[PDB]
Amino acid sequence: TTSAGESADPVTTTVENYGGETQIQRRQHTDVSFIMDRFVKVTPQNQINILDLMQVPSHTLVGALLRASTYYFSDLEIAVKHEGDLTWVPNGAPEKALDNTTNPTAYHKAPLTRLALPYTAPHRVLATVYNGECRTLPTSFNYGAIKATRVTELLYRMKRAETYCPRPLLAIHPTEARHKQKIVAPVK
């Protein structure tokens, strides 16, 4: 169909235009809450680690999709491999609090510690970008912090995720006509 292209009103033609038939679609895998709900690894600091989803690398599935939203909300689960006991403090806590074990402290139990944590920021939602300094995000954009004698692995998992105002999501720029890769296949 033709239309006024200057308008942002979406136009979605279908194959029925030339005699085809539109099929049924099942889009559960592109549901935001479902797709963000899985663990992703970040490289940890030795002891004190601020819980900040922007640490998730931008090329990962979770990191790229998170960056494709401007504002977001979620609760969180973390899985941590650590020596010693692990202490968590909420958003707004003095860093010294990390040495006091009345703050949620999980005693070491092999092979790792998994915890469910609530959102604790003072804002109604957080943002992946913030036009203040025109990089740096306000200090209040975090889910608290953790500390152990040694933290060797740290995974984040967004729960009940909500996203607002989509932003660019980019695939790899290929050099040839098509980006080609080795796909899994039965052997020789």
Next chain:
Amino acid sequence: GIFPVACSDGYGGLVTTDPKTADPVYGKVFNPPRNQLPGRFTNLLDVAEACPTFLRFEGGVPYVTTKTDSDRVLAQFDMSLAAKHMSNTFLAGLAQYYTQYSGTINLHFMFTGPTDAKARYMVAYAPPGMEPPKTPEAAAHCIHAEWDTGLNSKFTFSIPYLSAADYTYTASDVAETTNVQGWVCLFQITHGKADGDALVVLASAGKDFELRLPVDARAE
């Protein structure tokens, strides 16, 4: 006595996509209200349908320009979400995180020449199994649409999903020399004083477009 249980081997290890939740440690937290915030999206494909994004042509521009040759091919590219032409689209950005897709992909063409420039174009879908057509006459035998310029500057066309299997791969294998899903062929039938004018092209998901099987495949 107490309840006897069999602690089973092969179960219980942490799985990164497991369907259960962790034990909580800090309760009774009430959040600041966020109801009615603007711009929410709950399914990435709603965004993909509603917001078409630009294709990329030779030279790194989102348009093809009128030719004044005997060569009437404006663009010909692999119908692949891994194609260079689709590489800056939101659709390709989303598709890299799933292994399979099915359904309709819509292309939009917007003419930007002045009022005194006129043209007639043709889009055709060439299926795999034969080399793609080099002329509008050979391409006429394919599924295709022709349109001209006028008051409405945009034309939209649905590329149909046709394949032996019910799903196709979003990625392209190093062994597949010719594109397994065929080609999109855009021709200029003719033009009247439209030399140098640009036809801008965008793509969006169709009504039955579907992505399935999440996958995290990038190394960087």
Next chain:
Amino acid sequence: GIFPVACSDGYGGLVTTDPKTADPVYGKVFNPPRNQLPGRFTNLLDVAEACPTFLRFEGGVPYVTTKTDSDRVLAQFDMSLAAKHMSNTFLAGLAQYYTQYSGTINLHFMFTGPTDAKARYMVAYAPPGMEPPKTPEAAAHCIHAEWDTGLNSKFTFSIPYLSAADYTYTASDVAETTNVQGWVCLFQITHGKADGDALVVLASAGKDFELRLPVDARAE
């Protein structure tokens, strides 16, 4: 057979704030009766609302005295639960164990001069973003109240919660040079023979004052 279970990795370690209870070992203990004991409190904020405690001014005293200058500022301090002026209050003692707060804080001013000493005072709340006012004339443009002395010796005023976010921090960060929540400014408009007389100041929690997110942050 017996019931199979998956002993799950990542669960089961002792957590200092966990929501479950230990197994008991010594039963059937009945306690001496303690019903109707006087003075019970079940929420720390009931105490904070009902019992105002003293502010601390220069010199380590809970009052400011009438000035006989051209300088009409009695006190100006950061609206912060970490401010030195609030440091001996029950409110600050409670706030150090939570990371965030919201709501109203009430200030009380009690005149203690003799019957033949009269005065007129002004309290103003100056929000962050501009330097605090140095004179009653500049402060008039802020939210403020003026009152004079008479039969009733006390005046109470609510400092409003105004902020971009729904909660503010109880602690003050080493990087924040100017107080993020503004200032409380107390001025003397004028006085009649009140030289040297003391205006005692106290603070209590307002009706919607709220503390959230317990935290144990002291090293000593």
Next chain:
Amino acid sequence: GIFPVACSDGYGGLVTTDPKTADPVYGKVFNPPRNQLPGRFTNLLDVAEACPTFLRFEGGVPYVTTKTDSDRVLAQFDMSLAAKHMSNTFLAGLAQYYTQYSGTINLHFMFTGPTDAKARYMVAYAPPGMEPPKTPEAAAHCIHAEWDTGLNSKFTFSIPYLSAADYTYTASDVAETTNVQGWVCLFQITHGKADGDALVVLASAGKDFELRLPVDARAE
């Protein structure tokens, strides 16, 4: 407190045929539709009953040929699923994966001589305990059937299950010198100009044939 349990010794190890299922890790996968696909089979014995397959005789052929001697034995073989004569049948291919069977096995005989070749045959089942008969006269005392050629080229006969126990073994033990389940004896009573003509033989499962106790016994 929490629920106490006894983690029991002797339970929980992985068992290759256990009756429970693993924990899932990747949900919400919908399959392409496959309803009404042709050729489905849900029980291997339905196939064994409906599709008779060829016996194997000396020389590696699925038929016996008319003899012109005084010797009237066309074939005599052990009534065993491990017999060389049954070794290329689907029935034997299935039976090697179970340790016991019971019930009826059907043999089919199809005459392929020209219209002017006639013959009369006899099949007999000889039970264990006495040597198998060498002549049609001695075999007459066994359960048996005789038939001749004509318009219908095929004759089918049920070998009965007769044994002391309710089940018999599908495999044959190295210690059993004579077949524990007896013999199948096929004779030619006489023929009229059928020299060299072939009688093709096949076998299928009968209505009450049953295999039980799966076993994986091959080393190669």
Next chain:
Amino acid sequence: SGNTGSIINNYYMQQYQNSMDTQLGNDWFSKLASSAFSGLFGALLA
């Protein structure tokens, strides 16, 4: 169905335990075996 024998309900939803089948718009060998001729083709005596 299959080699499964627990009497209690699976802890996980079906949507997670297995892939879900869909339908568009049937045991051939069972019908074929059932259709087998089991009689006698001519006349029977005694």
Next chain:
Amino acid sequence: SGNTGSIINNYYMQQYQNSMDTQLGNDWFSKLASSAFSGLFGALLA
């Protein structure tokens, strides 16, 4: 009550889990805070 959050019943009887209170023969600060004067003591204008 307190920092406890299990939805299922305790496996042990109350008599064992905690000491049992007895009665002979009441939140003072809650009443005190509720009784606070929140008005205005004289006449109000505008």
Next chain:
Amino acid sequence: SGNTGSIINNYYMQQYQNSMDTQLGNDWFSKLASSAFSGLFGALLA
């Protein structure tokens, strides 16, 4: 909701398992996609 698939009730109260949302005093992209024009703008022949 999300990638969760247990059929049995969580052992912990909701108040502990997650933060609790509050309300003051809505899927924009779903409405936007649904509102898309899917017809034909002029006359249709054959």
Next chain:
Amino acid sequence: DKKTTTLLEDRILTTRNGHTTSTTQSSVGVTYGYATAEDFVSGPNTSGLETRVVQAERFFKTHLFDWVTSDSFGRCHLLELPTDHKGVYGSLTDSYAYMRNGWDVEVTAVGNQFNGGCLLVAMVPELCSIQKRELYQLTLFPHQFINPRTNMTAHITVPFVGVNRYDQYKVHKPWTLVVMVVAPLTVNTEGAPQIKVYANIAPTNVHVAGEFPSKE
């Protein structure tokens, strides 16, 4: 255009903001971005002390840039909002500590119908800078195109957005107006030689809280 010779028909739109109006005869409609109304304006962060200031809800103007034939695809002009304002709205930012408002934005690029080329105008939240590849997806944001053969005016209306219900505009700018060249300007023989791009903007639903002291 979906209307009817020169710029016309149901393509004539008049917008009124306060005592200011703007009329265009080549409208292509109005794009509402993210919502068609504001979310709650009275929440707990202002303790019922906020007020609306209707006198600030009116059009103000600025030049953006001059579109010339040498600009190529991707050439952009960014305008963070709020911007300098010397009228009533601007004085509010010096008088109150907290504020919120949406924007009613009109961008015009007046050449003639013999020019060719195309501009994309978009309102983008939290945008300081953008990469070249991301420009191919600028249509994910509330937008409208200006294509000389069809129109000279783009109109986008957006609500206030942000992690906070009220803002401190001296330190944060929630919206950025971006105008990008999609296809280069062509002049040919009868087109205008260049096209100056101007913005006519009105703050909407202006609320303020937290009165400041005077400098006196």
